């Protein structure tokens, strides 16, 4: 069983690394709007929409009981974005590089935990 400040003291430096990624971690910085956007299709790939800024709610409010759970989301996030976007498109490449620093350090913290 864990503890919630202690489960986001844990994780939200790995959070945090995504965040300080500039530019890539700017089209995940907040929620993919389909209709400020014009793209009607969105929701019809994406069904389970995820973003950094919804991850940290999570992490803040107590909503991850286990670190797996943190985990799925942040995979939700990518998983999304590669799914819909052209490979070489800024948000698929911007994506690949989070997807590169998360893999780098997220093991020495779920070991820990």
Do not use: H
């Not at 956007?37 to 950094?52: A, E, Q, R, S, T």
Request: charged content about 25%; proline content about 9%; aromatic content about 14%.
């Amino acid at each position: 069983i864990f503890k919630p400040e202690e489960l986001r003291q844990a994780l939200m430096p790995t959070l945090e690394a995504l965040y300080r990624q500039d530019p890539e971690s700017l089209p995940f910085r907040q929620p993919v709007d389909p209709q400020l956007l014009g793209i009607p299709d969105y929701f019809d790939i994406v069904k389970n929409p995820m973003d950094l800024s919804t991850i940290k709610r999570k992490l803040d409010t107590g909503q991850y009981q286990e670190p797996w759970q943190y985990v799925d989301d942040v995979w939700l996030m990518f998983n999304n974005a590669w799914l819909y976007n052209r490979k070489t498109s800024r948000v698929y490449k911007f994506c690949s590089k989070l997807a590169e620093v998360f893999e780098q350090e997220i093991d020495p913290v779920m070991q820990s935990l």
